[PDB]
Homo-oligomer: A and B are copies of this chain.
Amino acid sequence: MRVIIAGFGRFGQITGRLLLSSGVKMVVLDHDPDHIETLRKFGMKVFYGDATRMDLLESAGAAKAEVLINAIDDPQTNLQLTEMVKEHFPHLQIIARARDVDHYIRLRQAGVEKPERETFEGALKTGRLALESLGLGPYEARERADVFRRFNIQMVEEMAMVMILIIYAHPYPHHSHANKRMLEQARTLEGVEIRSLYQLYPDFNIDIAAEQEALSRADLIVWQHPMQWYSIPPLLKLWIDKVFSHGWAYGHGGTALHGKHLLWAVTTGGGESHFEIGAHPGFDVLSQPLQATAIYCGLNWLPPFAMHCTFICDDETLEGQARHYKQRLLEWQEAH
């Protein structure tokens, strides 16, 4: 229906099995009598022949499909398919396997956004296993692989070619009601940049230098998120831990944030009264770790923006609250 997979070897099988687990229906283009049994069990419609055939492509539903996964092993065949689909089926999104760097480059030049070098991530994993058996902790080792990946991707992309900042930290931005409205409203302003952490770093691999650059340009920084267990989401905590670095956000020479302002914009399921609990009751006390973090780094902490009772929230209330968020924002701009 929405998905076509070309090639059902080792690579296509795992990609297909992951989609099938997530409830996605697909058809397969394959031409290996060896895969007949695998295909039988897999239980999807099969088009048996060369994927480069226009007739098989059309009968597979290419003119209506959203995504083609090009899992073809042979670079020449893999590229020929890519070129055919680009020419004949302009709305069909190509996700491609690449054999190696030369193949990756040719795919990039054919307009595939992020071709996946078939052994790359396996090889990085193997590197981490070696690091761990040499005595490195698994997390430090994964971080080292993350740094190398970013570097390597930047190098191969070069070979191929050859003021408000909202730090948004909802884990499921597509599923958001309250925060999503707040952001729609904020974008109607100017000099607003939005960085959605769970969209940028689903693998919890923050690019510190990219984050520091954006902060450098901002006058007001906003930490916007749904409250989770009286606190913030894991990825926002990671962002603080990584981005607010020694010699940059604090410590000797760490003055990059001095003079800037910070707003906490948080949504909660409960209402004010729910926070009257424990030794230090009241919603305002929960701002403490954040305010302490901001102050330590030389930021000016603003009165938080807080939207309560999203659990029982009227759509009329969701709107007025979102517009007051924009209003807080506008008012800060006019003062600065």
Contacts and interface: CB of A to CB of B under 8 A. Distances in A.
B2 A198 contact: no
Contact of A95 (B71, B124, B129, B139): B129
Interface string A229-246: 111111101101100100
A67 interface: yes
A253 interface: no
A224 to B, nearest CB: 16
Interface string A6-43: 00001111111111011010000000000000000000
A14 B278 contact: no
Number of identical protomers: 2
A286 B66 CA distance: 49
B67 A142 contact: no
B120 A22 contact: no
Main secondary structure of the interface of A (DSSP, over half): helix
Interface in A116-150: 116-131, 133-142, 144-145, 147-148
Interface residues of A, number: 97
A229 B289 contact: yes
A114 interface: yes
Interface in A87-107: 93, 95, 97, 99-100
Given A116-B122, A172-B140, A289-B229, A127 B202 contact: no
